[PDB]
Amino acid sequence: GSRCAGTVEVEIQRLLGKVCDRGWGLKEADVVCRQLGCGSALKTSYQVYSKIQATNTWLFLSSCNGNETSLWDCKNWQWGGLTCDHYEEAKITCSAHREPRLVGGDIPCSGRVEVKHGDTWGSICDSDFSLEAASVLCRELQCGTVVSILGGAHFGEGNGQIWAEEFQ
Amino acid sequence: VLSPADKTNVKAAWGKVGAHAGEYGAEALERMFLSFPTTKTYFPHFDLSHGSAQVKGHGKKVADALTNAVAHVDDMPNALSALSDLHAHKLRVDPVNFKLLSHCLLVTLAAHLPAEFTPAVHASLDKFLASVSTVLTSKYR
Amino acid sequence: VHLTPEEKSAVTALWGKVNVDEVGGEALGRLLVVYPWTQRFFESFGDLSTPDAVMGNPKVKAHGKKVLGAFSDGLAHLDNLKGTFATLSELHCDKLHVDPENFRLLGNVLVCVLAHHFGKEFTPPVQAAYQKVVAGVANALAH
């Protein structure tokens, strides 16, 4: 769904391909997230939004440090020549899949909730945001524990688009 | 072959093993079962889970046998004659499993007695365990 | 066989605290002491009769450092061990004529050294993981 969550698809010389997860930890995962520009890597898995096709060729990552600015820049990455049948495809969910922010509030950790769906910042309907979701939002922004959930545009109506996802 | 210095080192090392021998043997059996699952085929009637009372009892028996061998280091074939007959004929344990158990015993002793597992003492204990295995695997056919 | 992520994490965590400059030398010295026929290949390393001479040999320590670096290289590429150890296996098989069982003996001695160094931290699960690692290294370094 979002640009920074899902399987790692690779285009090399107009050839579609997907990364095999052998030798694929979180160190290589955050290199991809940094390459796409979405912070660090959260998990080598994603919540599926749409089906994708299957490609015969695979990208194999032997090992690389994890501080590289791009996946191609880290040493000895193999493109094709092996089958990822014994292993699985390499998935990733970067930190900007749903990055929250609080706007419109006159105090540091209060305001209208806005969540970035990869690159676009959009509001949230108060029927799609539970107390657990607000707790996760406050924890992620290092704002501690949630005090209240104020619906009906308490901090003013946002300008843009409203997301249609209920956070479970 | 066990030199007199090697016998001295083995006797000292097993003496400082002392009363912890039963749980040393239990840990060695657990390490053999986890690292080398092929040795579990010789224990189909045992509960092989971690912390098993049956595995702990068998480790106590193994360590008591090793204590008897240490005390009779000059007459080990006679000390282990019953065990030699048992393992070689009734159980038909293949000698590679004996070497695996010797390695796991050495690992247990290294992990539990790091100060006294000197390279000379490690070599002496390896020689003693090889002697035990050879005595127990001699009659194998 | 593929190594499980928990086993890989345990191996990496235990290897992070391994003294590269000393653990390899300790393992090589223990191999030369326990299995004296392995001293046949290191006749150019000087005195190797007394165990104290073997463990205190500077050449033995340097070669153990190199061996442990090769172990680390094979650890970083656990899924591709034959490819990473092709050159070393060819060296040992043709230039040095080292018996493949010596690699398994050195793996077992290295496991003993790790247990000796880490005490109870070398749990039976991480020992099983390291046994898989050293078996893969020896098989990739053999034939």
Ligand code: HEM
């Ligand atoms: C240093 C090596 C070993 C020692 C000192 C040793 C010692 C012993 C002792 C004392 C017993 C008790 C027998 C009795 O009380 O009648 C025993 C039984 C047995 N051993 Fe070993 N053993 C060794 C190696 C092995 C290995 C490596 C295996 C298998 C991989 C093995 C398989 C068995 C089995 C299956 C029994 C029968 C236990 C039962 O039926 O409850 N032994 N051994």
Ligand code: HEM
């Ligand atoms: C088990 C894993 C082992 C690994 C990973 C390993 C690794 C290495 C490495 C990195 C080198 C240096 C290659 C070079 O200088 O071009 C080497 C050379 C050598 N290895 Fe091994 N080794 C292992 C086991 C053994 C064993 C068990 C023996 C003997 C019993 C042995 C004997 C030698 C010798 C004699 C040399 C050449 C010495 C020299 O160049 O001065 N290796 N090995």
Ligand SMILES: *[C@@H]1O[C@H](CO)[C@@H](O)[C@H](O)[C@H]1NC(C)=O
């Ligand atoms: C990453 O860290 C390594 C240290 O192992 C260093 O050599 C390399 O230059 C670093 N890369 C970047 C892009 O900072």
